Structure formats: structure tokens, C-alpha cells
Design a protein around this nucleic acid. Structure first.
Lengths: 221, 68, 136, 104
RNA sequence: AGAGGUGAAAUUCUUAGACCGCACCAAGACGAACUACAGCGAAGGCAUUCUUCAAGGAUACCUUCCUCAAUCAAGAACCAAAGUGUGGAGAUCGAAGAUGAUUAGAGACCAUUGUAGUCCACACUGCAAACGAUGACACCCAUGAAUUGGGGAUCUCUAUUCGCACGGGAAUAUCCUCAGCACACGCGAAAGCUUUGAGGUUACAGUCUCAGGGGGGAGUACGUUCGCAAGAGUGAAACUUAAAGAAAUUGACGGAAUGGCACCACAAGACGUGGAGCGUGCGGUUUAAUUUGACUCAACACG
């Protein structure tokens, strides 16, 4: 049957993550002119950040990270950051009637050559004293969020490399700063980064990938 | 064998249009050193029922009325 | 006989299940992380002889068991789950043969974790099938 | 003939908007104006309680101090599709005017 | 190895690999949740972001001006959807059409389809439950909690939370104020209206204008102006008719809901009634006469 011709592999993650090889998959035997590797490149593989890190009992079971296979070494599969998500149900429970939601998109070109969209979502807050039935924001304050949230994500992620950039996103350093600075404008309930998907990959350069994985762990198989 | 003999804990109510079947919460009868309860799976019974009825279930682990 | 990864026995190989349950049928479908490849594809109608009960929850229960018949053979112990409504424009409410899949999996001895809602959501939709008056 | 409502069944007073783009009806497809249609926001459990004990048992990470996900959807009903589903029912003339709003 | 779709199916797609699962790519539409008895616009209408071009209201002010104003036959501009013309576009949905069901019949309602169309530019059309079925401008008019703009005070109410960089800031709290959408008198046939009037009207008078005069016939006919056309504006009579209509009430009824209750109701279900043997009653046909009442339950072993 089909499981006969199939082979197994494990999926390595960039070294900045904790659990390195998080997945188990399959591909057909080399099978003549066809070549197992060439089909294994480009396969996105998904994860949940709390599975991938050993971090986050506290706030992140809710972010999905996903990777692509840019190389095949031995029985391993080496990856690069593809997108980060916020889970469907986490994002649907943030919304509230009577508050304003304020969304942005930011395109950054990292020092490492990648251009990534960044989807931010901010929700307005009722004040302590607030006697009123509305959180609604004046639209000149909404528009003066988007300029900050852009200016910061442009300034912070553009001078950085994806290795250090992904760690800003997965360790929510940006999200912490994007709230610190953008809080004095409008009181914000949560400001989150909803999707990061990486749009352009600069090139393929072996050393750049290898020095991204550090010391690659064994994959018997 | 197929006999898995539970208790009615309670009559969870009359159910159905004619007056016949009655919703019931069943406590699996079998007790073992690793006591296997469900603990409770709702069932529909055919005919009159009562507080301590022994209800051997030939089709086990079905989730009952739910839908209709 | 089973075809596994090389793994110290008793450790668990995760695979993903896509449960897409309409009101006319249920798919119980196992794939891997990506999903570029499948192990078991069983539909709630593969186990049922009529179109009336094609979608029934006792159909999905009988399908989700035969996914565990196969997974233990493919060496997949544990399953991440993705659950899906019939689709984006039509209906967002999951079909009756959902939940009868998961139970028939956990109660079949599979591990479970990290269920999600994959049901595709139209930020902005093309027109639904019904006329301006509706289905009447 | 007789006016049955000061509101005419809308959220729209005279000298307000005037148009209000219409939406499709859950369950039917009837286009009705977003004011007219009867909205409900839901927050539904993925799994029946007795189905949770099964699955919440079978999971390494889930079910202790951490719970399961839920289904979050608004539902916008044609006023016909709403009565048939009983989400709304007719009410006696004296009680027609009652607004529950959100309170607790 | 089924898929789809339904109340159940079938027409339709499938080993020539559909359904399903990932990542993308192409095209056209669309802007969910936030979204409200919210805002903006003369109405029609208007929902992603960034840039950009002219405007608009409200407010602020010890600026300017000095009656310049209100409403309006004719006249002009704008007007949703469908339509129409020439090019584009063609994803979704979909008049006509085709097919399968349903049905006594059933292109109908339901299902798989599908053309015009839906979308865009440039022209026409101007025919809506174009509604608040409520003309425009002005005055007077009590109450409670709210809401969107702007402004003022607190810096008797002064107070909360956030901390170069679009920032001597942003939001909130108390109170006031102008301007917007809304949730006591009096009037009304009643339903109801109320500082957002249908109030301040037999105690009848602030100003301008539009339309109505029992129901039909009929927005028809002729004429005429406008339109590519579809049609639009203007608009009778003969003749016919005693009511049509409005609000409210009490009944009745519902294949509306909500509590209930019944073996003349059902379930679960016991015993035979239905069609031969035969007791009469009825209907009938018959004959001098087959005397006659009573025909769903409440007529027929009954008078």
C-alpha cells in the first residue's frame, strides 16, 4: 500500500526557537527522475508557539508559527520563518461592541532581505471614570495611531535581521513597545499583531541558512 | 459479551410526541477496580421506567437525544 | 507491521485532522502539519448506504473510528484538530456530524490537542446563492 | 393601514440616514437592511459538556486551567426567518416596547 | 471512491482522480466582526488604508457688511433599481431559457444550470411603499436618563488613567452652553402626535406654495410636448354604482404562539366491526298499498 513507498523526515526550526525539530512528515522515495528533495522544498509546516517554545503557559498558546523548507540536509528539513498568526478563536473574542477597532498594515524590509506585511489590531478602552456608553475614538486620533504604529515598526524592524526580527515578534517585544508609545494617544485595551506573513525572500544563500540554524540535531529515521 | 448493565440515576424527563420514550441519565452498571463510569450518557428508553432500573445497553457509548 | 517514524516507542507522532462537516456530509481527513499529504480520507457517506443519513452523527462516528484503524497503522498517535463549517458565504454553523468525529477519536484512543476553527470567513463576500427574497 | 410601531421595525429614524446597505439572512438569504435584521452574537461551545470530558481528558496540554476554544459568530436574521426559528416571537401590544440592551 | 443537493430524490461532477488538504498564481466583484434606534449628504445615496483636489456644516469671535430676505407658476440641475446606446469587463449571483423533482396539473415555490444583466467609462430615461405615506420659513411650549460636533469653567463643583517627538498632549469625571439624530399641556374619529407636533384652530387671521372634493371608468381615450425605445409630463367624457373607505371593539376562524385537559383523543393494544350464514333499520326498485318521521358527530336495534 501507500505507506510502503513513503519516507519520513523531521522538520527543523531556526535556532532562535526552543524545540528545534517539531514535526514528522512524509515524502515518496526518490523514484527515478523525480527527486525527493525538490518536492520537499517549499512545503510550509505549521506549529503552535507554545508547542514550539517551551515558553508561554501564560499568554501564548494562541500564536501559530509556520515555516517553509529551504534546504534538505540528511534526513532533516531546514526551515525559515514564513508567517505568524493569531488563532481564529483568540482573535474573535477580542471584539466588543461599543468600542472602536483600529487596524493597520505595515510593510517592512528587514536587513536580512525579506519584506513582511504586519497586521496590527488596536481596541479602544472605556476609562475608569467613564460614565459614557462609548469607547469610540475620534478619527484624527485613530489616524495618529497608524502613523506611530508604522513609524515604529518601520524603524525597529528595518535595521534588524529576520533572526533578530522573529525574536522581536515571538517574544512580543514590539507589541509591548507599540502599546507603551501608543497608549498616551487613545486608551487602548489590547494592541496585537495579527499576521506577519513574509512576502519576499531575498535569495537562497546556503551560509545564511546554515548560520541561521546553528548546530543541527540528529534525525535517525 | 455484549451486556453492559447500567443504572438509571434519574428520569431526565419525558421526551417525544406520543408519551412513550423517556430521557434518562444512565450510570454504567459495571464496576471494576478501575471503576469505569461514563460517568453519564443520556439515553432514551422504550416503555415505562422507574428510579432504579437496570437497563442493559446493547449499543453502548452513544450520546442520545442531543439534535431532536 | 505498522509504519512509523523511528521513535522511541510510546512517544507520539502528531498529525492533523481536518473535520469538515456540512449539513449534507462529514469529512474526517488526516494530514501532516502542512497537509501536503494524507493518510486517511473517510467521509461520513463512505459508511452509509443512503443519502438521507449520509450526514448523520452516527455516520461520522463510524468514519472517525476507521481513521483510528488506519492511523495506528500509519504510526500516528496524537492529532491536532481543525474543524470547519460548510463555508464562507453559505453557512458558518458546523454540521451535526461534527463532535461525533472528535468523540469517536478520543474514545478510540487517540490523543488530541490544539483544536482550531478553519471555517473560511469572508471579510467581504460575493453574493450568496439565495435570491433577494431568500430561499422561501 | 394602522402603524404598528413608532419605529417601523428599523433602527432608522426619519432625518437619519435613508439607505442602510442590506445584508443576507442567515438560514435564508433574504436581503434585509442591516437595521431591520435581528442580530444575535453567540459565543458557542465547540463541544457538548459530556463531549468535553471525553476530549478534555484525552489531551496533554488542554483542559485543566486552560479551556477549549469556542465558536464566535453574529447572526443576522430575516424577520421571517427569525420568528420561525423562535429567536423572536410576537408579543402583546403592551409589551411590544421593551429593550433588553446588554445589561449583565 | 465517492461527491453534490434535498423533506426525500434526481438532473450535474467522478479511477481520464471529482470531493477533500496545504502553499501559492489569475481575474472580477466586495469591504464582514467593530456597526448603534451612531454619524455625513438637498434628496437619491454613503463603510479598508495611504496620498491627493475643491468643498460643507457646526462652533468660536467686542471682525466685515447693513435689509441684501421667506416661499414660489414658468425654467434649470440632480435622482435608487431596472431599462436603453457604443466600447470594456466578465468572479459571484441571475429575468428569459434548459433539465430534475413536487403536483390532479405546476414553465411556478425546491435543486443542478444559464443568457441579458449584475461591475466600469461616456451618453440617454426620470416611471419607486422616491415614506416620516407628515411641504417650506418663523415664533411659543414641562420632564427624565442618554447620544454625536464645537466651545467654556473647574488649573460648590478639582477630580481620575496614560507619558520630546503629528503631543504645553489624549481620553475621562462634574457643570454649563450652542448645533444635530432620537427614547406634562393640548389635540385627535380613534390609532396616536408632543421644545424632532398631528399642540398653541368655531376663542377659527404669522407668511408662501402644492394637491384633494362618493366609488368606478382611468391615469384610460383623443390632442400635444419630451424620449433611440421602453416610456414620462398634461389628461377628459359617455357610462356605471350606493356605498367604497378609516380607526377602534366584541365574536369567529388560522397549515401563529403559549400554558394546559380528554381513551366519545392518541400512544401500547385487548376484543371484533369492513366484505358470505342470518336477525330491521334505513336507502332503493317494485305494487292498489309497500303509510311515515329522523340523514356527519347529536339517523340508520330510533320513534
Amino acid at each position: 500500500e501507500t505507506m510502503a513507498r513513503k519516507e519520513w523526515y523531521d522538520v527543523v526550526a531556526p535556532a532562535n526557537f526552543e524545540k528545534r525539530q517539531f514535526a514528522k512528515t512524509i515524502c515518496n522515495k526518490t523514484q527515478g527522475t523525480r527527486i525527493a528533495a525538490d518536492v520537499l522544498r517549499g512545503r510550509v509546516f505549521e506549529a503552535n508557539l507554545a508547542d514550539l517554545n517551551q515558553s508561554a503557559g501564560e499568554e501564548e498558546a494562541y500564536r501559530k508559527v509556520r515555516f517553509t523548507v529551504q534546504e534538505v540536509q540528511g534526513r532533516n528539513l531546514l526551515t525559515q520563518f514564513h508567517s505568524m498568526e493569531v488563532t481564529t478563536d483568540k482573535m474573535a473574542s477580542l471584539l466588543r461592541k461599543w468600542c472602536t477597532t483600529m487596524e493597520t498594515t505595515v510593510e517592512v524590509k528587514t536587513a536580512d532581505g525579506y519584506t513582511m506585511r504586519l497586521f496590527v489590531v488596536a481596541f479602544t478602552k472605556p476609562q475608569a471614570n467613564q460614565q459614557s456608553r462609548n469607547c469610540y475614538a475620534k478619527q484624527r486620533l485613530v489616524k495618529w495611531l497608524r502613523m506611530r504604529i508604522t513609524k515604529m515598526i518601520k524603524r525597529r524592524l528595518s535595521k534588524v535581521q529576520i533572526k533578530e526580527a522573529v525574536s522581536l515578534l515571538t517574544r512580543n517585544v514590539l507589541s509591548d513597545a507599540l502599546v507603551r508609545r501608543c497608549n498616551p494617544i487613545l486608551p487602548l485595551r489590547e494592541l496585537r499583531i495579527r499576521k506577519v506573513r513574509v512576502v519576499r525572500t531575498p535569495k537562497f544563500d546556503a551560509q545564511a541558512l546554515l548560520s541561521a540554524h546553528g548546530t543541527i540535531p540528529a534525525s535517525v529515521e | 459479551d455484549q451486556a453492559q448493565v447500567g443504572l438509571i440515576i434519574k428520569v431526565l424527563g419525558r421526551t417525544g410526541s406520543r408519551g412513550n420514550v423517556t430521557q434518562v441519565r444512565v450510570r454504567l452498571m459495571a464496576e471494576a477496580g478501575s471503576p469505569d463510569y461514563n460517568r453519564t450518557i443520556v439515553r432514551n428508553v422504550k416503555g415505562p421506567c422507574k428510579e432504579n432500573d437496570m437497563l442493559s445497553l446493547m449499543e453502548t457509548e452513544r450520546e442520545a437525544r442531543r439534535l431532536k | 507491521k505498522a509504519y512509523g517514524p523511528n521513535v522511541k516507542k510510546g512517544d507520539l507522532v502528531y498529525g492533523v485532522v481536518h473535520i469538515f462537516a456540512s449539513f449534507n456530509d462529514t469529512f474526517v481527513h488526516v494530514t501532516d502539519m502542512s497537509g501536503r499529504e494524507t493518510y486517511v480520507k473517510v467521509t461520513g457517506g463512505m459508511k452509509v448506504k443512503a443519502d438521507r443519513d449520509e450526514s448523520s452523527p452516527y455516520a461520522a462516528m463510524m468514519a472517525a473510528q476507521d481513521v483510528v484503524a488506519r492511523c495506528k497503522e500509519c504510526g500516528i498517535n496524537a492529532l491536532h484538530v481543525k474543524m470547519r463549517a460548510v463555508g464562507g458565504v453559505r453557512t458558518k454553523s458546523p454540521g451535526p456530524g461534527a463532535q461525533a468525529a472528535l468523540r469517536a477519536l478520543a474514545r478510540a484512543g487517540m490523543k488530541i490537542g490544539r483544536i482550531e476553527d478553519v471555517t473560511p470567513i469572508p471579510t467581504d463576500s460575493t453574493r450568496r446563492k439565495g435570491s433577494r427574497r431568500g430561499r422561501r | 393601514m394602522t402603524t404598528k410601531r413608532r419605529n417601523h421595525g428599523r433602527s432608522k429614524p426619519a432625518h437619519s440616514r435613508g439607505r442602510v446597505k442590506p445584508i443576507h439572512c442567515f438560514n435564508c438569504g433574504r436581503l434585509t437592511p442591516k437595521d431591520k435584521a435581528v442580530g444575535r452574537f453567540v459565543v458557542r461551545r465547540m463541544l457538548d459538556a459530556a463531549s468535553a470530558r471525553d476530549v478534555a481528558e484525552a489531551s496533554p496540554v488542554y483542559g485543566a486551567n486552560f479551556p477549549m476554544p469556542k465558536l464566535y459568530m453574529k447572526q443576522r436574521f430575516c424577520i421571517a426567518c427569525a420568528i420561525h426559528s423562535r429567536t423572536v416571537r410576537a408579543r402583546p401590544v403592551g409589551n411590544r416596547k421593551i429593550r433588553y440592551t446588554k445589561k449583565v
